């Protein structure tokens, strides 16, 4: 159902509604999408829970 | 005679637009330059932020450049740099301005959900910011081609018009086009169709809407606004002195955050003025424009938008959108029981720091002093003999003292100041009731009442002694608090036998005499002879004597009791609640006078009394039930019982749950009513006898029984076991605190004590809160409710019955009928007999004479019902003051009202204080009862989808109420009988507004009083009905109107305005055009919404919209209230004031 | 703490302590329902004008209180005042009328 | 199957009171402003309020509160609406910009031609230089010197 | 509040529905929160912080 | 000192028209154009108003009366001073 009520269809699509979530107003880019959800819970930088 | 042109002392105020020409009259200069000051000699630069040629001199009758330094020179204009030489106070009054370069919105119309823009355009918001930002054109005036004239266009569709039509077609975008769309805008001709529009089509929706805003137009009209004006063309700048750049220690300076706004502004315009001059292509000068509109809308109010940041400050910049007293003082207070009623002890230093003024006038006044400077030096060295001139301006200057928590009016009292040596405050012991103040380092605040008529508003109303009742219900409230009654009653009191039993004296002097050479016990039983007088006859003392069988110590205490006073008052075991009822019947007797100085000697001889008792309390003096243990160890048989029950499956675990729950409670109360009976009688003593018992001397007993201080739960708490406590989960323990005090408690019953501790503190913390909350709404929404006539001479009133409920009188009728007015003569069981004749103030007496017959009710005058418009008559609203005469003239009734709801409100706890808010505000109830819309027999209609509707048959009447009731809900009603209206087609709570729509005015006024004094009166709180009358009164303020031939059909509208319009119309006019209408009921914070004065709702309302919406409207705020009164700082048009605004009130509007 | 007289804010003028010569009690709405129960205008009136706001006021009662005249000239207390230029610079005409 | 913003409405009247975050969320994708709902919040608290004791009057308060729906694209902030305006604007082609150049030469030689060809224009040079010899005025404030 | 997963309920106020309703969130030392939350309809939902 | 004002009420009813009345009174005596109508103990302007209303010789319409006639008294000295004035013709 969960699958259902999602507006996305593809990898590329689901960043692209997550960038405009996170930062909204402005365009998104392919980079921009990787990059933002790579640094976010992915990066040894900007996430740790030691 | 010419009226007048220089300043008078004026009436009302009016706000309104301004226009661009209306701000350049204020505007003393432009302000053309983004700088403020030359930064090497501070001066300010010529016009700029900071200027002295449009503002004004740096310093006072001093010319910039320094060319007129004199105080002669004054009315001239330098020639170097134009600068008039006043005051620098001018520099904080002459205003100033800028000229933009190109329109801009002005923030607060634009954006305050009434977009006014807007809604006077008819034209949605989103397209209106579209033009605004040039990001669409719209039309303007599209006469007669293609086009509508509120159409807004896109740039190829633009293009592409323009090109069809040169002429006869206009379109623009940006502030200029809204400006010119406000400006085409004709009042007259939109309302001319509006109307005829209005004529034509029948339709709800429709004409709701038109009527809405053709009401809306035709208001602007009238304001004298015009459209343009939400358009900012010139836009003036505040005085440099309001938003000062004053210097600090190490060089630094220090300035307002409307310094940096301003700056933006004058930049980003001047900017486009060169841009302009430049000949930029459009996409810039766009863009600019754009930014002059943030710039400006940031100025006036950063509160929507982004939130432009100071200067290197992450803070946002505070914008224009978005009290201490001097001669007074405050300290550490204390005892002082030597004090008289009417003085506190006031420090030495104190009192001369705060008295200086007058200390210095009176010293140069006796010629002490040359001059005042030698006065300050002589007061500063402290030679002696100033100490003298000080208790001479001391002695008939009274002082007022206060306390951190304010409630009721009692919170603030004058006093007479004694000098004290000492930094602490001596504080009457009989006041410490009124004040909330314990001594356990609690701080009061003193206040001096500097002008002749504050030291006589002070002695005639602040003082102590003219207030020695509760305002909340006629009980004294200076009755003796601990140490005092624990004296009377340690001397009033007897036990079986002792020195001096059974002998015989002549009077209380020698039974004093008796017991202050040892010879008599204090408490024995002695007769003696007493003289004994009343007052009964007409106007005059009859005295009488006899021999009464009395103690040695009501004897002797028989002294301090003045004149009419009978002995049997002070024949008692004189209790706390008995030495209350002393002072009260000595008051309604006696008089003032009599009572005060009674009430002094009463506490002096219980604080004496109390000191020789040797009143103390040792371990020993809480007894433990010698039968505790046991009853312990039969409970705990109970619970195995239980549980051997439970192992076998007998019982369920609920069910096993609450019957161990149950075996403990009554364990509980088993051990309490075994120390209570233990530590109450059995002192077991004898008199010539074997023995013989009677209530113990036992010291804890004693405190507790006279009400000094504890109770049987306390004491219950001390001997007895403690309790079942629950889990913060709110569960409780079936395994309770079998230990108490006075054994040790093992770490787990203190552990889980803990909670029980942590939630009291913050619920109790929480609920002050919640009573000041409470307490302001209430002051707000009654406020201004002052007694403004004399007798408004209804014969309309509520009836008076006491409350008989469930068993016998929860609440006499002799409370409810005293101090109040007869609405109409009241008759003995046989009539042609007039007792109470018409309106009478009903007082002791009366009601006592009311008591003598059998009478089982009276119809009384009410605030709620009384006739007057804008207030209330003093005839119908009561007597209960600090005072037991009739309410004076001009007192304000609703602030006491509240203040007196809003005290107790700390010691309430469906029910609690949410309680009574819930009722005040007539929220409707979670699940409702629903009352018969119509008599007449009923019948269950149609089948269920959603709701079973069910079908009201009138018998004369048609029928077309037919209500759909969700059939889900259990019924009541009987489907084959006739029902009443206002009858219960359900169970359930009902909302008041029901009760005022289907059964009555007076119904539901007797609902809410009745449903908040049960929630009040369930916690031993006493409150007189007046002032929850007087919030109902409020309450119901509003109604709407039903027919017409006056005024609209569904205006909400004051009840006052509305019968004074229909009154008006009964008469005169059309012979009697008057609509009628449906009284409504407002909850308390709703109805505090509606205040006439704008400046009065600028205050606790949302104060932009506010300001906003009144200004469109070009509305004019008379004042006439009291906080409207106190924000512009002058006479309060109530009480002492009442007479002026009276007076002024009258020579206005008039010749 | 005491206070007869002493030193002044500079944006809305009201008393406050600079010297540890500590600033006025202050007076708050609560104690001004007190003073409004009471039938007490003028102790109010001198309470939030010419004690406190009044920049007039207050040297010109305290001339009058060494005089040896009890009385208030009360004026308009400087809080308004600021108001009605702080509304007053915005596109709001604010008018004082009548006479 | 779709129209947003009723919903988090119709639900918010339904069950009295939503939470400051409940709005949020259930605000449609079109208005995420944060000082959007500064006022929404009084707008839903006069008729029904929670702001996690209000007019029952209800009524205009939904019309224009989805008169504010319907005007939640631009989210205004200047900095936006320019970077979008500016970003329409083609690049140049090097040999674009020497065309531009071309028409501007044109342009202001024109206008020099114009100004060489009235008569005034001389005999105001001359008595202008008249004036500089005669010491009435100075050679930097006529010409900036001629070509040379 | 420790660094790890952490499971709430919210069960009663929550659309006054007796439904209850449940949540996990994830709260790092540093960095963005993860929320994982159910909804009336069963659908469930993610949120970053 | 008057620890009571009861009485003073008594005599005017209204009890902040006394107020202002002993405040009018108090007036008189303070800045000193008069002089008291009961022995003055010490007690200041304030107390011996009060008093004065006590015994039943001052009140609003008594004062007005005097000021009333103070006024004529006044009138009385200026009768040539100001019908001296005819320069105004
Ligand atoms: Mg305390
Ligand atoms: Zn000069
Ligand atoms: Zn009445």
């Given at each position: ?6 507006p996305?269809?593809?990898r590329?699509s689901?960043?692209?509604?997550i960038y ?19 640094n ?6 900007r996430?740790?829970?030691? | ?49 900071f ?6 001199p740096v ?65 949605p ?12 054109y ?5 006469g ?81 606004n ?51 001059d ?7 000068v ?14 006036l109010?950063?509160?929507r ?18 009290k ?22 006031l420090?030495?230093k104190?009192?001369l ?27 500063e ?37 004694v ?24 701080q ?19 003082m ?16 003796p ?20 039993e ?5 009077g ?16 024995a ?92 309390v ?16 039969e ?16 019982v ?5 749950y ?6 403990w ?9 075994a ?5 109450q ?16 001397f036992?010291s ?15 004491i ?31 770490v ?5 004590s ?17 009573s ?16 403004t ?38 008759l003995?069981p ?6 109470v ?29 009384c ?6 008559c003093?005839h ?29 409100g ?23 009862a ?12 149609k ?20 209500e ?5 809900r ?12 206002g ?6 709570p009902?909302?008041?507004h ?8 007076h119904?539901v ?6 449903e ?8 031993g709180?006493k409150?007189?009905?007046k ?18 031939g ?7 509208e ?13 008469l ?19 109805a ?14 949302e ?7 009144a200004?469109?409207?070009g ?12 924000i ?20 206005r509007?008039?010749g | ?11 809305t003028?009201?008393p ?15 104690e001004?329902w ?46 308004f ?19 | 199957?779709?129209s947003?913003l ?47 004791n ?40 090097r040999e ?32 202008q230089?008249?004036?500089?010899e005669?010491?009435?005025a ?11 | ?17 007796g ?31 | ?11 005017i ?12 009174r ?51 000295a ?12």
């Amino acid at each position: 159902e969960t699958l259902r009520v999602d507006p996305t269809n593809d990898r590329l699509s689901a960043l692209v509604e997550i960038y405009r979530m996170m930062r909204p107003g402005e365009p998104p880019t392919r980079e921009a999408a990787e990059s933002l959800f790579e640094n976010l819970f992915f990066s040894e930088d900007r996430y740790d829970l030691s | 005679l010419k009226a007048q042109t220089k300043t008078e002392e004026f009436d009302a105020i009016k706000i309104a637009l301004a226009s661009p020409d209306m701000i350049r009259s204020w505007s003393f200069g432009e302000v053309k330059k983004p700088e403020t000051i030359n930064y090497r000699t501070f001066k300010p630069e010529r016009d700029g932020l900071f200027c002295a040629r449009i503002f004004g001199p740096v310093k006072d009758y001093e010319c910039l450049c320094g060319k007129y330094k004199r105080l002669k020179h004054r009315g001239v204009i330098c020639e170097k740099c134009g600068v008039e030489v006043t005051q620098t106070k001018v520099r904080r009054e002459r205003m100033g301005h800028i000229e933009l370069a190109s329109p801009t919105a002005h923030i607060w119309f634009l954006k305050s959900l009434p977009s006014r823009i807007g809604l006077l355009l008819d034209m949605p918001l989103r397209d209106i910011e579209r033009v605004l930002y040039f990001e669409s054109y719209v039309v303007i005036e599209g006469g007669m081609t293609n086009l509508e004239r509120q159409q807004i266009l896109t740039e190829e569709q633009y293009l592409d018009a323009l090109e069809e039509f040169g002429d006869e077609f206009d379109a623009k975008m940006g502030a200029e086009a809204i400006q010119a769309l406000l400006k085409s805008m004709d009042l007259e001709q939109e309302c001319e169709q509006l109307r005829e529009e209005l004529n034509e089509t029948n339709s709800e929706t429709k004409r709701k809407k038109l009527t809405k805003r053709i009401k809306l137009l035709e208001a602007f009209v009238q304001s004298g606004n015009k459209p343009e004006w939400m358009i900012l063309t010139v836009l003036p700048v505040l005085p440099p002195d309001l938003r000062p750049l004053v210097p600090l220690d190490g060089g630094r300076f220090a300035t307002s955050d409307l310094n940096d706004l301003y700056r933006r502004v004058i930049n980003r315009n001047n900017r486009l003025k060169r841009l302009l001059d430049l000949a930029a292509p459009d996409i810039i000068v766009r863009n600019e424009k754009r930014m002059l509109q943030e710039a400006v809308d940031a100025l006036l109010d950063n509160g929507r938008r982004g939130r432009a940041i100071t200067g290197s400050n992450k803070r946002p910049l505070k914008s224009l959108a978005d009290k201490r007293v001097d001669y007074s003082g405050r300290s550490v207070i204390t005892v002082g029981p030597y004090l008289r009623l009417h003085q506190c002890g006031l420090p030495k230093k104190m009192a001369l720091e705060l008295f200086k003024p007058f200390i210095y006038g009176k010293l140069e006044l006796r010629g002490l002093a040359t001059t005042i400077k030698a006065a300050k030096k002589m007061v500063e060295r402290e030679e002696a003999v100033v100490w003298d001139i000080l208790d001479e301006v001391i002695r008939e200057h009274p002082v007022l003292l206060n306390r951190a928590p304010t409630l009721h009016r009692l919170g603030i009292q004058a006093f007479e100041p004694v000098l004290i040596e000492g930094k602490a405050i001596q504080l009457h012991p009989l006041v410490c009731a009124a004040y909330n103040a314990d001594f356990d380092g609690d701080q009061m605040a003193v206040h001096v009442p500097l002008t002749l008529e504050a030291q006589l508003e002070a002695r005639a109303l602040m003082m102590s002694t003219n207030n020695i009742l509760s305002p909340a219900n006629g009980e004294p409230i200076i009755v003796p608090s601990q140490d005092v009654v624990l004296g009377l009653y340690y001397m009033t009191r007897d036990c079986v036998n002792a020195k001096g039993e059974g002998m015989v004296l002549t009077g209380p002097k020698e039974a004093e005499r008796l017991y202050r050479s040892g010879l008599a016990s204090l408490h024995a039983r002695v007769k003696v002879r007493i003289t004994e007088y009343e007052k009964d006859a007409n106007g005059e003392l009859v005295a009488k004597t006899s021999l009464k069988d009395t103690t040695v110590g009501r004897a002797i205490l028989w002294m301090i009791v003045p004149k009419g006073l009978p002995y049997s008052i002070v024949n008692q075991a004189l209790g706390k609640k008995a030495i209350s009822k002393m002072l009260n019947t000595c008051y309604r007797i006696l008089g003032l006078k009599p009572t005060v100085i009674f009430a002094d000697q009463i506490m002096y001889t219980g604080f004496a009394y109390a000191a020789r008792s040797g009143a103390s309390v040792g371990i020993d003096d809480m007894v433990i039930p010698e039968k505790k243990h046991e009853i312990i160890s039969e409970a705990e048989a109970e619970v195995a019982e239980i549980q051997e029950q439970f192992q076998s499956g007998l019982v369920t675990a609920g069910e096993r749950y609450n019957k161990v729950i149950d075996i403990w409670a009554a364990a509980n109360d088993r051990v309490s009513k075994a120390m209570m009976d233990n530590l109450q009688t059995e002192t077991v003593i004898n008199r010539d006898g074997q023995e013989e018992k009677q209530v113990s001397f036992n010291s804890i007993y004693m405190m507790a029984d006279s009400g000094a201080r504890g109770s049987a739960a306390q004491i219950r708490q001390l001997a007895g076991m403690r309790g079942l406590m629950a889990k913060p989960d709110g569960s409780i323990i079936e395994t309770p605190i079998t230990a108490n005090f006075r054994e040790g408690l093992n770490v787990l019953q203190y552990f889980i004590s803990t909670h029980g501790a942590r939630k009291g503190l913050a619920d109790t913390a929480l609920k002050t809160a919640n009573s000041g909350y409470l307490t302001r709404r209430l002051v707000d929404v009654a406020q201004d409710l002052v007694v403004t006539e004399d007798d408004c001479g209804t014969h309309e009133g509520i009836m008076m019955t006491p409350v008989i409920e469930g068993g016998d009188v929860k609440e006499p009728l002799r409370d409810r009928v005293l101090g109040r007015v007869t609405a109409e003569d009241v008759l003995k069981p046989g009539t042609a007999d007039i007792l109470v004749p018409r309106n009478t103030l009903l007082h002791e007496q009366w009601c006592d004479l009311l008591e003598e017959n059998s009478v089982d009710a009276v119809k009384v005058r009410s605030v709620v019902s009384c006739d007057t418009d804008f207030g209330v008559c003093a005839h119908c609203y009561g007597r209960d003051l600090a005072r037991g005469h009739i309410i004076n003239k001009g007192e304000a009734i609703g602030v006491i009202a509240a203040q007196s709801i809003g005290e107790p409100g700390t010691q309430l706890t469906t029910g609690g204080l949410p309680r009574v808010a819930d009722l005040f505000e007539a929220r409707r109830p979670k699940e409702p009862a629903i009352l018969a819309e119509i008599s007449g027999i009923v019948s269950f209609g149609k089948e269920t989808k959603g709701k079973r509707r069910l079908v009201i048959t009138p018998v004369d009447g048609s029928d077309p109420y037919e209500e759909m009731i969700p059939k889900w809900r259990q019924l009541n009603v009987f489907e084959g009988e006739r029902v009443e209206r206002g009858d219960v087609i359900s169970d359930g709570p009902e909302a008041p507004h029901d009760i005022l729509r289907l059964r009555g005015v007076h119904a539901v006024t007797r609902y809410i009083v009745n449903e908040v004094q049960d929630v009040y009166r369930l916690q031993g709180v006493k409150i007189n009905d007046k002032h929850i009358e007087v919030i109902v009164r409020q309450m119901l303020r509003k109604a709407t109107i039903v027919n017409a031939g006056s005024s609209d059909f569904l205006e909400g509208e004051q009840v006052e305005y509305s019968r004074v319009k229909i009154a008006n119309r009964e008469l005169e006019a059309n012979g009697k055009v008057g609509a009628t209408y449906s009284r409504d009921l407002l909850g308390i914070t709703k109805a505090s919404l509606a205040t006439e004065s704008f400046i009065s709702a600028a205050s606790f309302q949302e104060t932009t919209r506010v300001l906003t919406e009144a200004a469109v409207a070009g509305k004019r705020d008379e004042l006439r209230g009291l906080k409207e009164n106190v924000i512009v700082g002058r006479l309060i048009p109530a009480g002492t004031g009442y007479a002026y605004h009276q007076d002024r009130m009258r020579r206005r509007a008039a010749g | 703490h005491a206070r007869s007289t002493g030193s002044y804010s500079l944006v809305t003028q009201q008393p406050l302590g600079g010297k540890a010569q500590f600033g006025g009690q202050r007076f708050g709405e609560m104690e001004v329902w007190a003073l409004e129960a009471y039938g007490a205008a003028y102790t109010l009136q001198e309470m939030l004008t010419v004690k406190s706001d009044d920049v007039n006021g207050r040297t010109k009662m305290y001339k009058n209180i060494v005089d040896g005249n009890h009385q208030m000239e009360p004026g308009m207390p400087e809080s308004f005042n600021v108001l009605l230029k702080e509304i007053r610079s915005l596109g709001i005409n604010i008018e004082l009328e009548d006479e | 199957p779709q129209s947003q913003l009723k919903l988090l409405v119709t639900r918010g009247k339904e069950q009295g009171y939503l939470t400051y975050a409940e709005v949020n969320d259930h605000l449609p994708e079109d208005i995420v402003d944060s000082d959007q709902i500064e006022d929404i919040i009084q707008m839903i608290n006069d008729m029904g309020i929670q702001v996690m004791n209000t007019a029952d009057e209800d009524a205009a308060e939904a019309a224009a509160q989805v008169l504010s729906s319907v005007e939640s694209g631009r989210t205004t902030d200047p900095v936006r609406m320019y970077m979008r305006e500016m970003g329409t604007v083609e690049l140049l082609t090097r040999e674009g910009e020497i065309d531009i150049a071309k028409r501007i030469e044109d342009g202001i030689n024109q206008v020099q031609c114009s100004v060489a060809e009235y008569p005034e224009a001389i005999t105001y040079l001359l008595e202008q230089y008249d004036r500089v010899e005669a010491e009435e005025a100075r050679l930097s404030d006529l010409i900036t010197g001629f070509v040379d | 509040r420790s660094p790890g997963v952490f499971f709430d309920s919210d069960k009663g106020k929550t659309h006054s529905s007796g439904k209850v309703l449940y949540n996990a969130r994830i709260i790092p030392y540093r960095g963005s929160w993860l929320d994982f939350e159910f909804d009336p309809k069963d659908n469930l939902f993610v949120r970053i912080d | 000192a008057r620890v009571t004002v009861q009485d003073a009420v008594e005599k005017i009813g209204n009890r902040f028209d006394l107020v202002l009345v002993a405040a009018r009174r108090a007036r008189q005596m303070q800045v000193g154009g008069k002089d008291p109508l009961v022995p003055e103990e010490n007690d200041k302007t304030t107390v011996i108003a009060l008093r004065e209303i006590e015994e039943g010789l001052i009140n609003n319409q008594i004062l007005d009366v005097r000021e009333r006639q103070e006024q004529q008294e006044q009138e009385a000295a200026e009768l040539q001073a100001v019908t001296a004035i005819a320069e105004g013709r």
